[PDB]
């Protein structure tokens, strides 16, 4: 039988704790220094309450439908409330319960990205309906497709820690949303919690404390550091001087850009990605016109960018861990593009339905 | 001989770091956004200085008297300054020094719960006398009784991470105390540090990175998420709307409620506990009238609740890891009740003596 | 061949994450509550941008020159961009990539100590030139000398986690710098992040989750707790009352003092060191007159102190792990002194050149 390795258990639970920390309080403090002061308490409440909600839907049926065996698009309902998962059941080289929690913490941050930006302008019970509709019909299926062995996975999509599942996904939900700064120290601190937590997020994605977890970690430093410089140089060049928000934005942009690529590229490629992601993030927001919904522009643009550049940098040629066998780089790219296209369209269509449903149900705009 | 497993060493030191983080700055920031602005600096000083004091009493004789072999109520003085503990001495499957530190971090948070609430209204040197009297005559014996193999342990009390030792204990000290909000973002952040740190606290309690550490972790998410919803629903129902402090309070209430139960129950039971704990916490504070001493009401009520419900949910029947052999559920409950009753009365009597001593010595009320 | 142990991999990556957390946001928030309010945004930007810069110089050639095999003073350029380091290459009992990152995080905090204090009064591009000159001609060589097997190492200098490399080094750079509080809660929080992160820093220094990592951890608690009390008693005695900044300063002073000694002394010696370091820190700053450049006085004085007292407390006699064989205590001291003297003079001479270069290049004082 497969046996759980206590080291990987230890690593993976510390990593889950760090990804939880990205939401609570990481993204909550990031948005809190951005949104209008009079909406902060309300945003923090909404991010907390929906974080809880997500933890519960995950245990009730979320995990089972994303990770259970099913079809190309969703799993099954045989793990309602973690039924039939023996306590000692092993997944990979860790106990499955730890996989449940690790994966759950990703659902949480994804939702956090959206709720934090939209708390301001959305009626609460509308946010809840929304979270439910979209976590279920979008986050799960896509999780299932990329990581649950569905459509995208079996065509060989490469997304080490959730370019598509987390970022592009949430950026689309957020932008469909949008379609319908007071404390910078606070923003810095949240960016800081995010970055530090993003090590569980990227490294923990290896599922073990091995040399890929190691590669992922070091690429996480390289990319963020490079996206920071690249944002800064660009801000310095366009605006005459760097800025604190420009620096944090830079960091976030490298973190997002490296997310799908961290476990497959050379630190070489990490630093090319960080530069391009930071430049792209800046260029991105610079175009968004036509707050704090720019986050969706950075998450989305940098997610698109990192997902594409994963299909280049993974090459052995370019210092990467190598493409699947029989897979040319030209081909891996089609596949990265197809996964990006599917994520965008899926999240969008469900986003639209989620909001529309809440609207026709409780009304969207706050009372 | 028993041999230390490097994975459990690694896990247990990261877990100690997280529990330390619950005090420094977790509970310090929680109280800091609650107490009056003009008392914050002073509270933070007092929580820091007494945290130090506790770290030192722990090394000097704390550990030895709580964990050394003795009687039902206390250990011995054969580990003064960690004497006779060889560096490679192994306890469980980790080096004993790590056990020293893990256990020490619990003493620290327990004291933090009390000092943070009472810094406002207590003369400093009075707080110090108090910490000394009570850590020694109450925290240690009870630690020894529940975890040091004393009275309660050998009657089969179940308390995975310190319902009685930490929470009920400190709630009683705090309430005997009491008997004699300016920055909600700050409060959120401390609640956040607490929650994330509470993973070392609950999972680290398994003493190894095994499947019980895994069960504990996932129950930690389930309960907190559920207590949050349960607090919120109740606040929404009684007050017409949820609130940020109501949400953080919810989280804390699930965390406390799940504390004695995390390593013995099904995620099933976790989520029943989280709901009831969150409802009870709300009901609890709602009765306390007749600030920020409500914390003691939540800690105490939810501690009582989780300790009782551990004697139910541990049942195999109810998804739990099973009661000791020959132990009926009816019996486990008597035992949970007896441990609750003893903790309450013990902490109270020593609390009273601690304060009285400081009063008759330096005067209690601040100059 | 040497084989990487997954536990040590897991421990060492969590430890790197914690040391990163000491800079981002630990030292950034420490200084941020200290410096003038109108300079905070600018300081935070400068600490972020130079942190990035350091991450990149480290990968490009930093690591290779500090840790590669060379002479007494520097390594080589055979690990440019981590060339020729196979992904599975093992260093000690962890993968080398993890060593790269761990060591990198030390370069980052060291620079953070300096930039945070000097951001106020230094022209930005001047800070960048400086970071480059000094990281390269000072941090690396000294890293190489103490930890890269150079001069100091091979004379048997004892510096477990960087008394000289990190603290004395940066204190000298900072003081040569100097030569040419608004939010105390914020300061507390940064002190808090620092302390918690300092467990990766001290324990991770063992390179494995073993009993020395354990010794280091517990000495980290003992020393900080003792330096806090010692600062406090001294403040209470000289100023009539303890204070929040006096408490945080105390903690920092024990942390610095214990840094070179944590892995070699008895908790006995830890607590003698913490007391003396806290007293010395206070006495130190008390003399500095003739802000927030006192940090350099504490870092420097306490670094000098801990490095000397390592040459005493390591003795078997005094509870320590024992001196090298054939090494008398009298001799170990000469060696501690010689390493202190070399670090001071080296960092100073390069510091001076670094600033002078930036001055003659962009001008030092801000426009």
Curated annotation (Swiss-Prot), chains A, B, C:
Positions of transmembrane segments: 10-31, 43-67, 97-119, 124-148, 163-178, 186-205, 213-237, 244-264, 267-285, 293-314, 330-358
GO molecular function, one term: ammonium channel activity
Chain residues that bind NH4(+): 205
Protein name: Ammonium transporter AmtB
Annotated consequence of substituting residue 167 to K: Loss of transport activity with methylammonium as substrate
Naturally occurring in which organism (per UniProt): Escherichia coli (strain K12)
Domain-related comment: The C-terminal cytoplasmic domain plays a significant role in normal function and it might also mediate co-operativity between the three subunits. The C-terminal cytoplasmic domain is also required for interaction with the T-loop of GlnK.
Effect of residue 198 to F: Retains 80% of transport activity with methylammonium as substrate
SUPFAM superfamilies: Ammonium transporter
């Amino acid at each position: 039988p497969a046996v759980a390795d206590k080291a990987d258990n230890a690593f993976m639970m510390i990593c889950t704790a760090l990804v939880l920390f990205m939401t609570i309080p990481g993204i909550a403090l990031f948005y809190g220094g951005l949104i209008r002061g009079k909406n902060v308490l309300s945003m923090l409440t909404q991010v907390t309450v929906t974080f809880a909600l997500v933890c519960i839907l995950w245990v009730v049926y979320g995990y089972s439908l994303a990770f259970g065996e099913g079809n190309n698009f969703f799993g099954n309902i045989n793990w309602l409330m973690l039924k039939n998962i023996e306590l000692t059941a092993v997944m990979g080289s860790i106990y499955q319960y730890i996989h449940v929690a690790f994966q759950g913490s990703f659902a949480c941050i994804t939702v956090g990205l959206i709720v934090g930006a939209l708390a301001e302008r959305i009626r609460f019970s509308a946010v809840l309906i929304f979270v439910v509709v979209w976590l279920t019909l979008s986050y799960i299926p896509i999780a299932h497709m990329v990581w649950g062995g569905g459509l995208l996975a079996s065509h060989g999509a490469l997304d080490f820690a959730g370019g598509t599942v987390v970022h592009i996904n949430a950026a689309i939900a957020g932008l469909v949303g949008a379609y319908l700064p007071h404390n910078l120290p606070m923003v810095f601190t949240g960016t800081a919690i995010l970055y530090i937590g993003w090590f569980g997020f990227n490294a923990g994605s290896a599922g073990t404390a091995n040399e890929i977890a190691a590669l992922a970690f070091v690429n996480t430093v390289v990319a963020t550091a490079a996206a920071i410089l690249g944002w800064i140089f660009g801000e310095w060049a366009l605006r005459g001087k760097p800025s604190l928000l420009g620096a944090c934005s830079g960091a976030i942009a490298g973190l997002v850009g490296v997310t799908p690529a961290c476990g497959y590229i050379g630190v070489g490629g990490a630093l090319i990605i960080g530069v391009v992601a930071g430049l792209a993030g800046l260029w991105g927001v610079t175009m968004l016109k036509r707050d704090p919904c720019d986050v969706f522009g950075v998450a989305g643009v940098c997610g698109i960018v990192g997902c594409i550049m994963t299909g280049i940098f993974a090459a052995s040629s370019l210092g990467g861990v190598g493409f699947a066998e029989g897979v040319t780089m030209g081909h891996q790219l089609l596949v990265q593009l197809e996964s990006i296209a599917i994520t965008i369209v899926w999240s969008g269509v469900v986003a639209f339905i989620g909001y529309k449903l809440a609207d026709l149900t409780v009304g969207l705009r706050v009372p």
